[PDB]
């Protein structure tokens, strides 16, 4: 129902996809666990959109949302109705979501509208 696209920066790289691909490359089986949880959550976002509710997704600031597959966090935005765009990844080492991350997403999102 809802399409999901990956953000591609100026360099032609997609940060979230890059992160999942290196997880795919690792021998560790917890890499597989994190991958599977990310698989479920993104797919869940695809079907229910932002209506999925917590714990899966959370509204952060303004246009920015986050996906919460375990301790992985994927910042995304509404886009191109009815779709979404995954901006970037960070592992959360605190119980606070740094606005360092959020402003990076805002700046990423900025880059999207520009181009």
């Amino acid at each position: 129902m809802h399409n999901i696209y990956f953000y591609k920066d100026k360099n032609g790289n997609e940060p979230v996809f890059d992160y999942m691909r290196e997880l795919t490359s690792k021998k560790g089986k917890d890499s597989r666990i994190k991958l599977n949880k990310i698989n479920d959550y993104i797919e869940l976002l695809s079907q229910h959109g932002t209506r999925a509710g917590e714990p899966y997704i959370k509204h952060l600031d303004a246009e920015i949302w986050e996906l919460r597959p375990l301790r992985d966090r994927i910042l995304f935005v509404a886009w191109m109705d009815g779709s979404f765009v995954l901006l970037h990844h960070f592992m959360k080492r605190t119980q606070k979501t740094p606005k360092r991350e959020i402003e990076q997403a805002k700046r990423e999102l900025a880059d999207l509208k520009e181009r």
Partner: protein, 92 residues
């Protein structure tokens, strides 16, 4: 159109995951979906589903968070309360 808008998730998903992993993922989200579409729509809480299905709260909780796969009997019970159930269908 837009260079900032990259790969579609359908393609990314197909590349990073085996056919097997995707099917099991689709089942987990289908179950998660039913529990979600029960909660914000039908107003059926987890307390409420517990006594409807006879299945307890910790068991339905773990059934939603896919860490350990559920027993078939519990899944069929929970789904029955929600008006669904599983069928054996051809792979495609």
């Amino acid at each position: 159109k837009n260079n900032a808008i990259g790969s579609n998730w359908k393609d990314v998903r197909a590349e990073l995951f085996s056919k097997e992993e995707i099917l099991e993922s689709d089942m987990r989200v289908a179950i998660m979906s039913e529990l979600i579409e029960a909660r914000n729509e039908k107003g059926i809480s987890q307390k409420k589903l517990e006594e409807m299905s006879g299945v307890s709260q910790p068991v339905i909780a773990r059934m939603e968070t896919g860490k350990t796969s559920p027993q078939l009997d519990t899944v069929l019970k929970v789904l029955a309360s929600l008006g669904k159930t599983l069928a054996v269908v051809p792979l495609e």
